[PDB]
């Protein structure tokens, strides 16, 4: 069947990706030992989309855990469901990228890209005909942004007609760990717009805001922040695992959202999100699901989507729900705030119904849309880059490791070209 492949990059992508396999194992009822529990038919039919048989009845994930430092691969295998991944699937680095994109992309990830491209190809020709690669990686950090973009460069040259979904977490404006945030961020942006079929963005500062005001958690640990992102991780690709009344692919989402190849940046949201004291009193009905999903407080990216237009949006629905309130209420949100949707494309919404509700929720939804409210986030990384580049700050760590300043000058040139054709349609 159609099989999709996960690649974890950076310490962010290693931990997020390792918890992505928690919720897929939860949907598919797989024990940490690799066996299956539940004894249900369609839960196990198209298991091959994420898992491979290991002639022992265990299901190994088709994932590539990969980093420049063994601190995070040790933490994945020590934690829960850590005895599930293949040991060969861990590609170990030893020096560790010191939050430097130049050594991630040219000099230290270069002797690691050959080892990991062999692993990615190993899980590729072993099957009939794949669908593509969807990855999870970091932008603020060196081992994610510097070396993960190398792998996207390599797999596009060998598999050209496939799909590059990237779940890319971005640096935060307000909270600022990793003092060189925009350097590792922008150097992977222009090397991903010419490299990825679709990019869809995650922000830790918006994930903090969701878990504060809509989840009502006083002490949000990183495992909690890795969970409500992982709900959207399982959502986008759930239609290829369970049947439904209107099925779809990531091929379907790519063709039916983006109008031009230069823009493929989506927004990711998930619903329902309901607090501990609130699950009893809130009626999970589809009109309640659909305005929560169209709310800036629910947005996993901290770009305010009411400050720009929605160009094209695609939303699944996952569960046993009636199809009047599948389609006519996105007509209603097309109509009532018609000024928040673009004019030159009529009927800007898309739907696809899956028949199996997720674990504990009778119905759920994920928002995937190339809203053109992304300019204010590309500027908030632009103006901190230009502020730290006109003083020539922190450039001896970059120009001294095998790259010239002309690579920087074409980075703002693709940045400005990308945002000029965003502001064109708004």
């Amino acid at each position: 069947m159609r099989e999709i492949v996960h690649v974890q990059g950076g310490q962010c992508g290693n931990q997020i990706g390792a918890k992505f396999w928690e919720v897929i194992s939860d949907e598919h009822g797989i024990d940490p030992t690799g066996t299956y529990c539940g004894d249900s038919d369609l839960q196990l039919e198209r298991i091959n989309v994420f898992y491979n048989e290991a002639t022992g009845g265990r299901f190994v994930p088709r994932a590539i855990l990969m980093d420049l430092e063994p601190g995070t691969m040790d933490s994945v295998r020590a934690g829960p469901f850590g005895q599930l991944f293949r040991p060969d699937n861990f590609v170990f680095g030893q020096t560790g990228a010191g939050n430097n994109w130049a050594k991630g992309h040219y000099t230290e990830g270069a002797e690691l890209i050959d080892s990991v491209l062999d692993v990615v190809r190993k899980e590729a020709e072993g099957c009939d005909c794949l669908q593509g690669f969807q990855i999870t990686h970091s932008l603020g950090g060196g081992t994610g942004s510097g070396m993960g973009t190398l792998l996207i460069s390599k797999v596009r040259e060998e598999y050209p007609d496939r799909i590059m979904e990237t779940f890319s977490v971005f640096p935060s404006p307000k909270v600022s760990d990793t003092v060189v945030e925009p350097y590792n961020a922008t150097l992977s942006v222009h090397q991903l717009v010419e490299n990825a079929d679709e990019v869809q963005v995650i922000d830790n500062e918006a994930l903090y805001d969701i878990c504060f005001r809509t989840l009502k958690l006083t002490t949000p640990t990183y495992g909690d922040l890795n969970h409500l992102v992982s709900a959207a991780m399982s959502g986008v690709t759930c239609c290829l695992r369970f049947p439904g009344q209107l099925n779809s692919d990531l091929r379907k989402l790519a063709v039916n959202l983006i109008p031009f190849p230069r823009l493929h940046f989506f927004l990711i949201g998930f619903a329902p999100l309901t607090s501990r004291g609130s699950q009893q009193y809130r009626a999970l009905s589809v009109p309640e699901l659909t305005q929560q999903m169209f709310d800036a407080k629910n947005m996993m990216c901290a770009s305010d989507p009411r400050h720009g237009r929605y160009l094209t949006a695609s939303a699944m629905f996952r569960g046993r729900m009636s199809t009047k309130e599948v389609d006519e209420q996105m007509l209603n949100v097309q109509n009532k705030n018609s000024s928040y949707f673009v004019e030159w494309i009529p009927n800007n919404m898309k739907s696809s119904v899956c028949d199996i509700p997720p674990k504990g929720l009778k119905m759920s939804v994920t928002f995937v849309g190339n809203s053109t409210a992304i300019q204010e986030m590309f500027k908030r990384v632009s103006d901190q880059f230009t502020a730290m580049f006109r003083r020539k700050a922190f450039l001896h760590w970059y120009t001294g490791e095998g790259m010239d300043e002309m690579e920087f000058t074409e980075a703002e040139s693709n940045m400005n070209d990308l945002v000029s054709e965003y502001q064109q349609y708004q």
């Binding site: 939860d26 989840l215 909690d224 969970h227 504990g360």
Partner: peptide, 11 residues
């Protein structure tokens, strides 16, 4: 996790 109990809520 508390996010696991909350997202998957039955009782």
């Amino acid at each position: 996790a508390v996010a696991q109990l909350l997202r998957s809520s039955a009782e």
